[PDB]
Symmetry: C3
Subunit: 591 residues, 3 copies
């Protein structure tokens, strides 16, 4: 009922089992290590929903099987989703490691001399790899004194990266993906793969035909009082763009209201379907009040719904935003055109950062030659080598305007718990609602148009399913760029002026698909992509290794790739070790 | 007889299915794109046999399954062996793609803004990869205006490279490889693998014992009128070399004329076996008149035939040349020593270029130190880093002399439809026929000795079968070099002066087998290679990807490798993605 | 009974089968090649046990299957473990190659022009790869005259590397690994994998509970005379160290003599268990006199034996050394803590070099910042980039002190047949025997403390078993460094002053795990490693390819990797070709 038993982090203090003074002289330091680790995690980490992260420590230090078993008994009743084993000394490898085959696991060995914790680390990892249960290694660079209790910056970074990814894995487990509708215009990702969700992500799929949304609307299976409040909020805050439809299709005020009204109801009903709504019990809809336990959803839309009813532009834009008529909240994950694979990339991004995700059509690659030819401007700066036009077909999280600001005053996208109502209103003020183009969307609709501020670091990702290989992940870190007004207008009126725009410039590496901007575009595996704030490729890489999804393309620095130590046994090559290891271990949950 | 149905190219114009003016406004531009594609292909391409290429266009634009089905019906009765789907707009991915699992497929999406054809391209490719039916991508670099009907250079290159390789694939399908004889001196490639031909190339294998050649000659199963003509031509044109059998094993008793007569008969009979000959019906040999429908053949020769009858040097040299007593014609593909794997490399080279192929023994690697020691000259130019001696054991297509000339006057090898009678005669004049060395070829024979002109770009290739892996392809682009007269003679007399020579220098890259000339030699997987005119490694790489044969070695620029888009999902590494993708998809026809 | 039929090298002179002059003119040169090869091998190689290597040559030259069969019959009764086929001419590929699927095979083709041996080489190799029985290629760089009988330096290097590795393979076949005890402190390598030994190495595993060692000691199942001699030798040569034990635990006089006496007995009994001892048969203990035919062993020790009896430090240090009370001898291979995987690395190293192997705990990585912080000295030279502290928990071959000297007077470790009594005594004089720390080793013991001289080239290796992948090899060439007297003391006192130390600096490459010293440590797959004298990575790589064990990490120059030619067919990439080939061929003996 909200806070539906969030996963916890289990900390396992391991120790030398022998006495005669040995174990007893190490007891305090070992538990301190465990307490220090828990303190750091609960302080620096938050679930994507906003809640604080809880850690569970073993009742005693673990020196053998009896103690390990006791710890396991404690953890399994506490819903721990990942573990971190810590130690400042030598311990008995296989008798003390966490044997659970599915939960993400890490081992931190104190780097000391009188305290040879790193020696255990190496021995424990060897046992993990020999037994087919990969684990992450956390080894600090510089030697620490036996009395030093601080956690080095390099160790802290790895602990946080491991836990952040680990939590993402644990949070998806058991949740549903709501497929509202089916295949949208033959888009591969909208042919929802039930097995992928179940085997790789540990999720379930709930399929619902779109006539169900029509039923909730027509039969008043919604909160009527909330509707009136949503309309008041729209009236007070919505800035409307110009209608670019052919004259015969332009709707008079009354009809335009009917579209706005229905559009807001769509947002309400979809949200209610995803997480349930107790108010529905008040109106005789107890079954419907339960929801589908969905942590992500997709709305087919075209062609069947949109050829007669308002499109999902408004609903998708609002639900994916960090706010609405009820104030700021955690953004939902709703994929347009029911593209579940983009939904998955969005889910991952959200679980890792707690921020709103931008759904985008990778529409055009603008070479510097093409820019010059159509606008006369000889482009420079981040856009010097080409630019990719990212515009979703009508919706995008309003947070995407990048009107929020960080400590230093820079444009950014932040976790909902750091967004002020002022920033929420600013994002709404930077958005214009434009009527949907009638020939494509016969039932009408309202698109969210904004222009993302330039100079913002972004990470573009996409998951694709390749028959005979399985799922693969693509990553491209880059920046949004700002084009001079005149140039932006030429390009914008030539493409789709009523849709949200983000001009993207990927960081080039000079090798492979990152030789130039054209290659990044040419090697993208679908027509959609997801934008997550910042340069979080390293996080996506760690998360993918936990799920055994090969990263077929990325521009992240080799030194920043952090995966279970077993990957290294599969080769020195960052790509080869990945394809070999993933094929070896396979999906986390089955087959 | 001849022109036995050549494969056609199917062009599929795909379009957005919705009306209200949308589809009707895109119809003309879409069909124009199809027509422009057909025009370009029929104009720039020719079948290796010289015939023009025919394209079949769908009767209507394809927007969904009903239309896709109608198109398929039309194509299947027209013998189309490869398709190219073209479009200037968004279309419904899985409802419009070519589902045929075996034919090569490509998609060309117009790179426009009001015309988002590339958006469809990316979506359709994603569906191809999700459904395990890989397709090639044709995406132009620069944005074009909606009214622009020209085909950019970069788009034209990809279209031609795809079509050229796809035609090669479609042309081999259904044809036979004629194994005349069996294993020649334990040479691996002469242990003909029937499964390889059937599963990978879609061909059949016809084995014929060599006693059948003896029968055709002894029982006069050939055109007597034609033999008279061949002899006349030989007498009139053959320049003879000095005999070298220590003034003992020579033919002063006129067995020389008998050998010549038999050698030409071998050429006639082998040819008749390959494609048939209606004249044989006139003399009662109707079964023999049919031929074996062979598109390539191998003649065992040693040891069993050559220990008593004239060797195959003359027949092989003539058959592989672009001319004979009947004028210029398409060269045949006849592998010496029945090395079917070299025959396959030759087949590929011929189907891709329409030119004669040079069969060669990779005989000696000459290091610059070795050259200086034996001749005194410190070599420079292309030969500066070492040189490889390529000499087949007595035969080579006379075109190999490089006496033909291109527009700019450079020495070259051309498709038979561009070879003039003058050029054919010039090639014959550059060749000297030398008597076979008795101790090796007891039945006698005549070798074709010529020296290939220096500075000509060549591509050396070889196909090998690795148990546990399957077939692999090796490519090495380089140039023929010209050695100063004093040097050539020292090396030539020291090796095999009566055999055709080609001094080869491979382009070095500094990495792998291409670190130095010695490594190129050391990593070649057999004692034979095939030389194809020009630097056509890129075409061989595209063709190999269509047949799923891994390229284990090559020196082609990374930017020039063009394969189905699915390959990228298997990795950014050019080699790793190949081995992984080939193992995934497997042979095209079975298992 | 000693000299238990050492494997022999078979030399196969191959030749053109045709008479009438050909074969007869080549007979003498071909056999000379065979004789020259045998002469070189027997002169430059020695079995690790000290014996000279014997070569068996075929009775006649091999030109076909009848002769090949005859040769095989002769070889199989002579215990040949590897073959080298030599030839100066063209021969009949598949009819002449060695078809044995398990023995290491090489082919040396003379690089001449009148003598086209290289042409046969390439053909034979192609047959080997097509038939799934990989073979090594020996092709010289520079062309030789037909009358030249010398073996070039580059050819010599490849012949020796192949033979040395091949002998190692043949020597392990059929021998046992003695597991004295079971798992030691949960260490993965001590959970002995019977299948690994049987399938990959072709060895057997003999398990013996440690109570058996207790029984031999208590029931006097050993040579009483010898013990008297061992004690005399110890009394006269052992230099003792400061007792670091807490005073209440310091044992003195009587007890100390008892610990020494038992420690030496452990060495004797373990040795007797490995190779048998006839003297035991004299005393009526016949079953025990046989031994277990063990070529390598591991002693569990902790926790169960050491919690009550003297530890294995002294036994392990003596047995792994090249000398003891009986003079210099071949060192034994005894793994501490029964770490069989380190035992295997030691076995390989010893079989390849014939020298003593150093067992080590990869204890600490000292970054330059860490060094500076704790000692004040800013470091340069080999130690400039960081250093790795290698210290085994109490024992190490005394040879490890590097008190032996080579021709040039440099510190080194030599094959026992080159070690003089003077050097043996020098190593013992550089060692101090220190009492074991009571809380860890309650039964007592004596550790061998010495400091390895700096500037000596070393090769650190490790074998690990990765579930789902199989065994993998790790290599890291580097040098031991010498730290200034003041710095060494700070670090040594801070760690474990009573244990043998080796400061190691790995050669950096700038790529992968060899970017910096930290990465070398962080990517080591266990807490143990083996040190072999010199830079023998190339030998380890060749040996591994013969056993199909992928090398997951190494810093050897790409030009020095020598593997069967079939590896190249699996790719140009040194790593990718390896994983692909190893997966293809699998273990040498089964499954
Ligand atoms: C309006 C078009 O149908 C639009 O919906 C498509 O371009 C859509 O983005 C497919 O991804
Ligand atoms: C004359 C020799 O037998 C010659 O035929 C061989 O070298 C042949 O080239 C094998 O490839
Ligand atoms: C004394 C310790 O138990 C010591 O034996 C361990 O560090 C051992 O080296 C494990 O590898
Ligand atoms: Mn879209
Ligand atoms: Mn040949
Ligand atoms: Mn140890």
């Amino acid at each position: 009922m909200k806070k539906i038993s969030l996963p916890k982090i289990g900390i396992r203090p391991v120790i030398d089992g022998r006495r005669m003074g040995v174990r007893e002289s190490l007891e305090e330091q070992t538990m301190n290590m465990a307490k220090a680790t828990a303190a750091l995690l609960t302080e620096k980490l938050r679930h994507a929903c906003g809640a604080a992260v809880e850690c569970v420590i073993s009742d005693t230090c673990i020196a053998g099987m009896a103690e390990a078993a006791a710890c396991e008994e404690k953890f399994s009743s506490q819903n721990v989703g990942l573990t971190i084993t810590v130690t400042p000394c030598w311990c008995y490898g296989s008798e003390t490691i966490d044997m659970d085959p599915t939960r993400p696991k890490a081992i931190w060995g104190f780097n000391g001399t009188e305290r040879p914790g790193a020696v255990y680390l190496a021995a424990a990892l060897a046992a993990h790899s020999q037994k087919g249960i990969p684990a992450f290694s956390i080894y600090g660079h510089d030697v620490q004194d036996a009395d030093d209790t601080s956690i080095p910056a390099d160790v802290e970074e790895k602990l946080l990266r491991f836990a952040r990814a680990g939590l993402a894995v644990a949070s998806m487990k058991g949740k549903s993906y709501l497929s509202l509708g089916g295949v949208s215009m033959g888009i591969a990702g909208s042919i929802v793969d039930h097995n992928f969700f179940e085997s790789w992500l540990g999720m379930k799929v709930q399929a619902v035909d779109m006539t169900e949304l029509r039923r909730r609307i027509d039969q008043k299976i919604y909160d009527e009082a909330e509707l009136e409040m949503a309309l008041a909020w729209a009236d007070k805050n919505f800035r409307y763009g110009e209608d670019e439809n052919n004259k015969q299709y332009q709707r008079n005020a009354e009809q335009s209201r009917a579209v706005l009204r229905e559009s807001l109801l769509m947002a309400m009903c979809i949200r209610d379907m995803m997480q349930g709504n107790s108010k529905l019990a008040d109106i005789g809809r107890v079954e419907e009040s339960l929801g589908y336990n969905a942590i992500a959803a997709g709305f087919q839309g075209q062609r069947h719904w949109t050829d007669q009813y308002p499109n999902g532009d408004t609903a998708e834009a609002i639900l994916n935003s960090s706010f609405d008529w009820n104030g700021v909240r955690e953004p939902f994950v709703v994929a347009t055109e029911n593209d579940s694979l983009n939904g998955v990339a969005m889910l991952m991004g959200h679980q890792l950062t707690g921020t709103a995700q931008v759904f985008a059509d990778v529409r055009t690659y603008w070479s510097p030659e093409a820019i010059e030819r159509v606008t006369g401007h000889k482009l420079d700066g981040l856009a010097e080598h080409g630019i990719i036009h990212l515009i979703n077909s009508g919706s995008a999280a309003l947070d995407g305007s990048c009107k929020q600001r960080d400590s230093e005053g820079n444009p950014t996208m932040k976790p909902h718990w750091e967004i002020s109502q002022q920033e929420a209103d600013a994002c709404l003020a930077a958005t214009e609602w434009c009527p949907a183009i009638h020939e494509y969307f016969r039932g009408g609709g309202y698109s969210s148009r904004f222009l993302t501020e330039g100079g913002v670091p972004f990470t573009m990702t996409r998951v694709n399913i390749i028959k005979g290989l399985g799922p693969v992940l693509q990553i491209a870190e880059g920046w949004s760029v700002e084009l001079p007004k005149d140039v932006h207008d030429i390009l914008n009126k030539r493409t789709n002026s009523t849709w949200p725009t983000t001009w993207f410039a990927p960081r080039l590496t000079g090798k492979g698909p990152f030789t130039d901007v054209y290659s990044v575009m040419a090697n993208w595996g679908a027509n959609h992509g997801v934008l997550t704030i910042g340069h979080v490729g390293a996080d996506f890489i760690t998360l993918a290794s936990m799920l055994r999804i090969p990263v077929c393309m990325h521009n992240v620095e080799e030194t920043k790739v952090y995966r279970p130590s077993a990957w290294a046994a599969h080769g020195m090559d960052i790509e080869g070790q990945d394809y070999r290891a993933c094929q070896n271990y396979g999906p986390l949950y089955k087959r």
